[PDB]
Design a protein around this motif. Structure first.
Motif, PDB file in Angstrom:
ATOM      1  N   UNK A  56      35.286   9.123  56.280  1.00 33.57           N
ATOM      2  CA  UNK A  56      34.406   9.096  57.429  1.00 33.57           C
ATOM      3  C   UNK A  56      35.111   8.848  58.772  1.00 33.57           C
ATOM      4  N   UNK A  57      36.238   8.156  58.774  1.00 31.36           N
ATOM      5  CA  UNK A  57      36.927   7.842  60.019  1.00 31.36           C
ATOM      6  C   UNK A  57      38.138   8.742  60.251  1.00 31.36           C
ATOM      7  N   UNK A  58      38.989   8.874  59.230  1.00 30.71           N
ATOM      8  CA  UNK A  58      40.088   9.855  59.232  1.00 30.71           C
ATOM      9  C   UNK A  58      39.614  11.147  58.591  1.00 30.71           C
ATOM     10  N   UNK A  59      39.814  12.284  59.242  1.00 32.42           N
ATOM     11  CA  UNK A  59      39.375  13.592  58.702  1.00 32.42           C
ATOM     12  C   UNK A  59      37.848  13.749  58.467  1.00 32.42           C
ATOM     13  N   UNK A  60      37.025  13.522  59.503  1.00 30.02           N
ATOM     14  CA  UNK A  60      35.574  13.763  59.365  1.00 30.02           C
ATOM     15  C   UNK A  60      35.195  15.241  59.116  1.00 30.02           C
ATOM     16  N   UNK A  61      36.134  16.129  59.415  1.00 30.80           N
ATOM     17  CA  UNK A  61      36.060  17.508  58.969  1.00 30.80           C
ATOM     18  C   UNK A  61      35.663  17.550  57.505  1.00 30.80           C
ATOM     19  N   UNK A  62      36.417  16.812  56.701  1.00 36.63           N
ATOM     20  CA  UNK A  62      36.299  16.849  55.253  1.00 36.63           C
ATOM     21  C   UNK A  62      35.137  16.013  54.726  1.00 36.63           C
ATOM     22  N   UNK A  63      34.824  14.907  55.396  1.00 35.99           N
ATOM     23  CA  UNK A  63      33.581  14.178  55.107  1.00 35.99           C
ATOM     24  C   UNK A  63      32.420  15.168  55.235  1.00 35.99           C
ATOM     25  N   UNK A  64      32.379  15.882  56.363  1.00 38.87           N
ATOM     26  CA  UNK A  64      31.309  16.832  56.636  1.00 38.87           C
ATOM     27  C   UNK A  64      31.070  17.769  55.450  1.00 38.87           C
ATOM     28  N   UNK A  97      32.287  -1.039  53.151  1.00 36.40           N
ATOM     29  CA  UNK A  97      32.363   0.385  52.818  1.00 36.40           C
ATOM     30  C   UNK A  97      31.000   1.012  52.917  1.00 36.40           C
ATOM     31  N   UNK A  98      30.060   0.449  52.175  1.00 36.15           N
ATOM     32  CA  UNK A  98      28.688   0.916  52.210  1.00 36.15           C
ATOM     33  C   UNK A  98      28.059   0.880  53.629  1.00 36.15           C
ATOM     34  N   UNK A  99      28.261  -0.191  54.396  1.00 33.85           N
ATOM     35  CA  UNK A  99      27.637  -0.324  55.736  1.00 33.85           C
ATOM     36  C   UNK A  99      28.051   0.786  56.689  1.00 33.85           C
ATOM     37  N   UNK A 100      29.314   1.209  56.588  1.00 31.71           N
ATOM     38  CA  UNK A 100      29.826   2.245  57.480  1.00 31.71           C
ATOM     39  C   UNK A 100      29.675   3.660  56.941  1.00 31.71           C
ATOM     40  N   UNK A 101      29.758   3.850  55.634  1.00 28.73           N
ATOM     41  CA  UNK A 101      29.316   5.132  55.071  1.00 28.73           C
ATOM     42  C   UNK A 101      27.925   5.484  55.576  1.00 28.73           C
ATOM     43  N   UNK A 102      27.000   4.554  55.413  1.00 26.18           N
ATOM     44  CA  UNK A 102      25.635   4.743  55.862  1.00 26.18           C
ATOM     45  C   UNK A 102      25.599   5.146  57.327  1.00 26.18           C
ATOM     46  N   UNK A 103      26.298   4.400  58.177  1.00 28.92           N
ATOM     47  CA  UNK A 103      26.392   4.727  59.603  1.00 28.92           C
ATOM     48  C   UNK A 103      26.822   6.175  59.803  1.00 28.92           C
ATOM     49  N   UNK A 104      27.896   6.560  59.113  1.00 28.05           N
ATOM     50  CA  UNK A 104      28.486   7.897  59.216  1.00 28.05           C
ATOM     51  C   UNK A 104      27.608   9.022  58.678  1.00 28.05           C
ATOM     52  N   UNK A 156      35.453   2.808  48.562  1.00 30.01           N
ATOM     53  CA  UNK A 156      36.767   2.508  49.198  1.00 30.01           C
ATOM     54  C   UNK A 156      37.300   3.703  49.957  1.00 30.01           C
ATOM     55  N   UNK A 157      37.343   4.825  49.255  1.00 29.82           N
ATOM     56  CA  UNK A 157      37.931   6.046  49.791  1.00 29.82           C
ATOM     57  C   UNK A 157      36.995   6.929  50.628  1.00 29.82           C
ATOM     58  N   UNK A 158      35.765   6.471  50.909  1.00 34.15           N
ATOM     59  CA  UNK A 158      35.055   6.870  52.143  1.00 34.15           C
ATOM     60  C   UNK A 158      35.456   5.965  53.369  1.00 34.15           C
ATOM     61  N   UNK A 213      41.322   0.583  57.043  1.00 31.07           N
ATOM     62  CA  UNK A 213      40.435   1.341  57.931  1.00 31.07           C
ATOM     63  C   UNK A 213      40.237   0.842  59.381  1.00 31.07           C
ATOM     64  N   UNK A 214      40.209  -0.489  59.573  1.00 34.19           N
ATOM     65  CA  UNK A 214      40.349  -1.202  60.886  1.00 34.19           C
ATOM     66  C   UNK A 214      40.317  -0.398  62.202  1.00 34.19           C
ATOM     67  N   UNK A 215      39.606  -0.921  63.206  1.00 35.03           N
ATOM     68  CA  UNK A 215      39.634  -0.275  64.496  1.00 35.03           C
ATOM     69  C   UNK A 215      40.799  -0.725  65.357  1.00 35.03           C
TER      70      UNK A 215
END
Lengths: 159, 36, 204, 58, 138
Positions: free
Chosen positions: D39-47, D1-8, D34-36, E4-6
């Motif tokens: 970042x992948x679904x709905x990046x509109x809302x992450x933004x 979770x943390x590794x990809x939040x950071x990426x995003x 968990x619920x970040x 989340x998986x690709x």
RNA sequence: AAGGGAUAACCGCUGAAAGCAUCUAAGCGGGAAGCCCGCCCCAAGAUGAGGCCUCCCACGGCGUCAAGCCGGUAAGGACCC
RNA sequence: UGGCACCUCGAUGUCGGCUCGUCGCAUCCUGGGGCUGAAGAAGGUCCCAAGGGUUGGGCUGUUCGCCCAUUAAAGCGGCA
RNA sequence: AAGUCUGGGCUAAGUGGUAAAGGAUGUGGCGCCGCGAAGACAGCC
């Protein structure tokens, strides 16, 4: 000076004179461009590194300058019985004790002289090269021999 | 020549640090030293 | 790099000036250049000759008449000679003059599974006094717990002979252009009837 | 979770350290690493959330 | 559930060359690319990093006095089989090697680690003798 | 072994910091049976499996449609002697 | 040469020799070099340097030693 | 996994990345003493 043309690049300096031109590599630790009837050289903060570079600069420049208005110099007084020198071309066939005479090539900028059969001098526009090739000759036979034989500088004998 | 306490054996001796090492240069060849 | 292919025929000795010289006779027959290696498409510079011509037309895929001198690709095949690029039209013996110096590659005679103390000239053990089951053995092969293994390269028994071997700097005693002959100063590797190649040396 | 939040969130200017501090002050006891996957679904809302975050941060 | 998986997406290619840069300080980011650690697909067990082409190797800056001083090493399994070769001699011949060695060391050491080292293409250049994309990063 | 390149102690050029002097702090030369390459040998399982020359090419009949298909070929290669 | 007693007493063969080596340099020869109370030749002494070399017999089980006859030298140590 | 985060200094030995008596015009920061128009500190009368 007189017929001297002090040119400038980014990190080099080209000094044109009546005898030819020379190339001195000079550090980015200054801004000197073609200036006045002579040349001034300054430097940043008075820290140990800079200090040492000023003065070094000051002289390489000055030496190239005096080189392009004839900077020849350097002479060897050859001593010993069978010992003597003889010019062949602009190269030098000196004979100094070995079972065999000794021949010597001059590179770019340089000429050897044989005024006496036991005196010699080296002409040069550069300077580094001159002092270099001076010693290179002295090498062939340095002195010592609880006194006498061998080929000396303008300097002189010892215990 | 090669010792741990190099010092000046004359009034003609000279302390120069070259090669990253400590040396000593006199007039007479016998007082020429180097720290090691 | 001057260089013919050839074959050991045998040896004897002749006289010269006033002494016997030992000589070994090579048949370095005519070697038809079949391919040139350029640095432009091969990357390196060389020439591929051929030797024992004789072949009752069993030549199929490598029929490669493709270079004019295809006169029946040789039984004893064809080898490159590295930096060597002549007037492209066969190489006979004429290249080597008497008094010239040559290196000679070859295939040493085959000793097979050889014992240590042939393979390597070891001492072995005493024909008498103490033991009797180790006259020809190697003795020790290690230390103890450290390093607790055997050194890579250790000299032990195994296959000896039948190997590529170049003896360097032999004298060309003579050359019979007539017969495609070449005489050298004795002792050239392998058996009679063996392929060898003969080059210039590297001397002084 | 943390590794990809950071990426995003590194993809918007800032880093992970910064982003989480932001949300803390911003009063959104939410993301729940968990619920970040937002970042992948709905990046509109992450933004949107990143704006709130750098809101309390600069 | 939350995986989340690709799903398999088209792999990207990239060209880069900090020919004027400190290696290590270069090689670090390269590797971070060779793993998909920049993108939020990231998945540790799979290989969705960027393919990476680096033009104009050699040229790299190296701090301090690291010539003769940085020594590289290979041991054959033999007695006295140690080889010691200094940095100077590696740029002198096989400089593509220098930046290669440095990235290797920053990649994990499993099978997947070797798979990613294959995704990394290094040429002392310029001119990268394969054209079919390369969104250059500066 | 010739030979070519880079070095060790050591021997120099030019040169300030430090108007002198200093092989050094920016630079440049010499210098070992030693180091690198050169000589001989192995080597593309160098899964980073390389390159050059020459050859042989047709779907003939069937699935989640190029073998994951069976049965005859081609250039070739084995078997037995 | 000893001190201590930590694995090993349901076992870790123990001196010397032979066979086969490999590594350290604190270098016995051969290669560079600085001093010398170095005229030359021959030494003394310290520095760089293992790449390769480092003999054959008499006495004793000997290791070691002494002795005969030679050598460019007849090196000191580690690997149970 | 998380800052190539911010602000001020030191170090050029890879010190850092494990050693003493004793040696050294290595550097950087403080000193408080000579004596300098009886104007020699360095260089040729």
């Amino acid at each position: 000076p007189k017929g001297v043309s002090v040119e400038v690049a980014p990190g080099r300096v080209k000094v044109k004179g009546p005898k030819g031109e020379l190339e001195v590599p000079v550090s980015p630790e200054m801004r000197v461009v073609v200036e006045e009837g002579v040349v001034r050289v300054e430097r940043p903060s008075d820290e140990r590194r800079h200090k040492s570079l000023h003065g070094l600069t000051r002289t390489l420049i000055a030496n190239a300058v005096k080189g392009v208005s004839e900077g020849y110099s350097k002479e060897l007084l050859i001593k010993g019985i069978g010992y003597r020198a003889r010019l062949v071309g602009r190269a030098l066939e000196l004979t100094v004790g070995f079972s065999h005479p000794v021949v010597v090539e001059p590179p770019e900028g340089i000429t050897f002289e044989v005024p006496e059969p036991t005196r010699v001098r080296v002409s040069g526009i550069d300077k580094q090269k001159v002092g270099q090739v001076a010693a290179n000759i002295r090498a062939i036979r340095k002195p010592s021999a609880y006194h006498e034989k061998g080929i000396y500088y303008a300097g002189e004998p010892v215990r | 020549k090669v010792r741990a306490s190099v010092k000046r054996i004359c009034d003609k001796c000279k302390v120069i640090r070259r090669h990253g090492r400590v040396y000593v240069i006199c007039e007479n060849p016998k007082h020429k030293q180097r720290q090691g | 790099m001057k260089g013919i292919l050839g074959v050991k025929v045998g040896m004897t000795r002749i006289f010269r000036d006033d002494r016997a010289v030992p000589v070994t006779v090579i048949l370095a027959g005519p070697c038809p250049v079949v391919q040139r290696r350029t640095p432009e498409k091969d990357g390196y510079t060389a020439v591929q000759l051929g030797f024992l011509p004789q072949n009752p037309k069993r030549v199929n895929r490598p029929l490669k008449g493709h270079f004019a001198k295809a006169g029946v690709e040789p039984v004893r095949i064809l080898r490159e000679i590295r930096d060597f690029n002549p007037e492209g039209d066969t190489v006979t013996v004429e290249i080597f003059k008497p008094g010239e110096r040559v290196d000679v590659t070859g295939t040493s005679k085959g000793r097979g599974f050889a014992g240590v103390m042939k393979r390597w000239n070891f001492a072995g053990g005493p024909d008498s006094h103490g033991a009797h089951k180790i006259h020809r053995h190697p003795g020790s092969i290690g230390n103890r717990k450290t390093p607790g293994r055997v050194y890579k390269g250790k000299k032990m028994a195994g296959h000896y002979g039948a190997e590529r071997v170049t003896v360097m700097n032999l004298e060309v005693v003579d050359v019979i252009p007539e017969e495609n002959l070449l005489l050298v100063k004795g002792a050239v590797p392998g058996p009679n009837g063996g392929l060898v190649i003969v080059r210039e040396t590297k001397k002084a | 979770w943390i590794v990809r939040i950071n990426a995003a969130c590194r993809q918007h200017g800032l880093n992970y350290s910064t982003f989480i501090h932001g949300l803390k002050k911003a009063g959104i006891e939410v993301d729940r690493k968990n619920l970040a996957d937002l970042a992948v679904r709905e990046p509109q809302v992450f933004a949107e959330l990143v704006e709130r975050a750098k809101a309390a941060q600069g | 559930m939350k995986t989340y998986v690709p799903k398999q997406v088209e792999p990207r290619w990239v060209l880069i060359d900090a020919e004027g840069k400190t290696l290590g300080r270069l090689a670090t980011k390269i590797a971070t690319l060779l793993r998909g650690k920049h993108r939020p697909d990231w998945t540790p067990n799979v290989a969705m990093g960027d393919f990476v082409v680096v033009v104009n190797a050699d040229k790299i800056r190296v701090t301090g006095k690291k010539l003769e001083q940085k020594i590289y090493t290979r041991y054959s399994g033999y007695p006295g089989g140690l080889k010691k070769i200094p940095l100077e001699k590696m740029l002198a011949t096989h400089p593509e090697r220098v930046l290669e060695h440095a990235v290797k060391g920053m990649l994990p050491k499993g099978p997947l680690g070797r798979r990613l080292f294959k995704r990394l293409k290094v040429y002392a250049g310029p001119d990268h003798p394969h054209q079919a994309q390369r969104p250059e990063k500066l």
